[PDB]
Amino acid sequence: MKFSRDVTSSRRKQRKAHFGAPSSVRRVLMSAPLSKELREQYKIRSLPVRRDDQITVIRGSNKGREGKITSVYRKKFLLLIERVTREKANGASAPVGIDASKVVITKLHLDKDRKDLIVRKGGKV
Amino acid sequence: KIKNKIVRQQQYMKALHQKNKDKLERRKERAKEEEKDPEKKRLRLSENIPATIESKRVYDETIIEDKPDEELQAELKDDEFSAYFSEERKVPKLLVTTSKRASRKCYDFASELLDCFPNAEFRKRTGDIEVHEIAEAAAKRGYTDLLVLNEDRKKTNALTLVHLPNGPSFYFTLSNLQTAKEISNHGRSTGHIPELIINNFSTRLGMTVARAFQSLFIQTPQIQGRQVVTIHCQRDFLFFRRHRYAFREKSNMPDGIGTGLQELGPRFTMRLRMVQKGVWDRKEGEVFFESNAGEESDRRKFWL
């Protein structure tokens, strides 16, 4: 139960805030769990996704698939992964997007900012 | 994306009209340059074949090549159905039975099945006898295949057949069951033995079913009656039809000769749900093939 009258439990406000969230807020909304090994060695439960992250699809029709996140489609809250696509009628391979929570990060693209984020968020590189 | 309904309908209308215009222009210019140069007309017609489910069927290695295979013919010459296909030529003797306490609707279809098969009996199912007990009883009484028409709620929805005495048992779910009255331009069958034709049973499991259906019919049809019973497997749906055929002229036909079909009935469809190795026991049967529903959602994936 929330006790703060600063936060709203109104569904209308939560739904408006989610879908009218800006691209900087959507950056945090698209977060994926790390694998067990990364979770137990970086001491971080979950990170926002990024391009060039190595992930495994955990739920859905594409369960078990792996690949690198080619891009993040933040407008539709969707991820795009290498070779996880769908063939169209004409023979084109139109990519299919998956929710960031439905994948798991198995190899992080470690920039310098992530390492600073890791140490800041109770982590040990 | 446009959350105004009218505008998104006008935006689609403009998009649709432009899409139709430039696809027509591309078609028109292609038509002009093809009639001018046939060398690209049939060139396109030889690669741009429309795709269909059968052409896009998922790969299964169990599909047998048209060329004869020794290993398959080694396994098929001494199996349960061998006494029908060997030099013995054992005449099939069918037993037809309904589920316990069936209605007149079940018998109005069982009679049509009886018409489809000469020398096939029908013992009304009575008392506390079971399918594993009829099989033993019919085995000692000279029968070689027992069909059980299952109905509930005044509709025949299933058909299990067991190959006597211990041959494979198949479980089908009938559908679209039409009687001869319900068929337009029907006919009255005669006593002539029908001729069976079977199509499109490519997979090896298909041959197990095809031999099971072949073993029901007498191996020597009476051609003078020109009655033909068709078992066709399309996208795993088995269609059972009976027809009267008479050859005549046909300008559309390749050799100028074509046959006219008059439907005899009954008309129905089956789906193969279970195949068991032995007498049909629902609880303790050795499952040869179980039809997983979640795997049949692929419209391009067939087991028959």
Binding site: M1, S9, R11 | -
Partner: protein, 226 residues
């Protein structure tokens, strides 16, 4: 209410006698009738058949009224509280509540009333030294001070017989909160527990007593023959 600027039979018109904010929303009850109902609701909480009749899963509670030590007031973790309810076998009511969480039927879940569930035990404490936070996340459990008993929490729905888990000090202060029928309450001014219309409420004990069955005229038949 609706807007004051917003015939009633004409579409896009105005409704008949539009709603006003100055409707009577609250209602007064004599403070003695409020206190009588709190006393009646507490007395019912000590009848195990009224607790079962209200839906509580108290079939393995050691004793009703269920009163626990004052160590419970100093609980810190929900694990300690969930453990306590399991030894006193009050947790089956918590399983009843946790399993009963549904989505609401109606438009009421478009109005922030999304979920519904049953009501678990009412823990009544005397001092808050950690008990409230250790118990407040177990679904259906409500904690309340013994100085501020709420009729809304003592007869949910107007239905009598809530399952109350008292602490020793809460139970000790019940006589100061409510008083006697002859002696006054210490924590209410000049307040005495209501008196009853009958003395022994078992009327079948009165009717079938030797006092009354010794002077009655001999009874005719039950359902009589035709």
């Amino acid at each position: 209410a609706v807007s004051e600027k917003a015939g009633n039979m004409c579409r896009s018109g105005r409704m008949f006698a539009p709603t006003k904010t100055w409707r009577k929303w609250h209602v007064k009850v004599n403070q003695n009738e409020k206190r009588y109902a709190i006393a009646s609701a507490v007395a019912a909480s000590g009848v195990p058949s009224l607790l079962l009749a209200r839906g509580h899963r108290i079939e393995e509670i050691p004793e009703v009224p269920l009163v626990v030590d004052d160590a419970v007031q100093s609980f810190q973790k929900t694990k300690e509280a969930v453990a306590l309810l399991k030894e006193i076998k009050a947790y089956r009511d918590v399983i009843k509540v946790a399993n009963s969480r549904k989505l609401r039927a109606g438009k009421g879940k478009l109005r922030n009333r999304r979920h519904v569930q049953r009501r678990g035990p009412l823990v009544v404490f005397n001092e808050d030294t950690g008990i409230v936070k250790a118990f407040r996340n177990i679904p259906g459990v409500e904690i309340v001070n013994v100085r501020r008993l709420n009729l809304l929490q003592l007869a949910p729905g107007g239905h009598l017989g809530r399952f109350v888990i008292w602490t020793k000090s809460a139970f000790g202060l019940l006589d100061s909160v409510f008083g006697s029928t002859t002696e006054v309450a210490q924590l209410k001014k000049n307040y005495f527990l209501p008196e009853n219309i009958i003395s022994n409420a078992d009327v079948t004990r009165l009717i079938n007593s030797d006092e009354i069955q010794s002077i009655v005229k001999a009874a005719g038949p039950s359902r009589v023959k035709r």
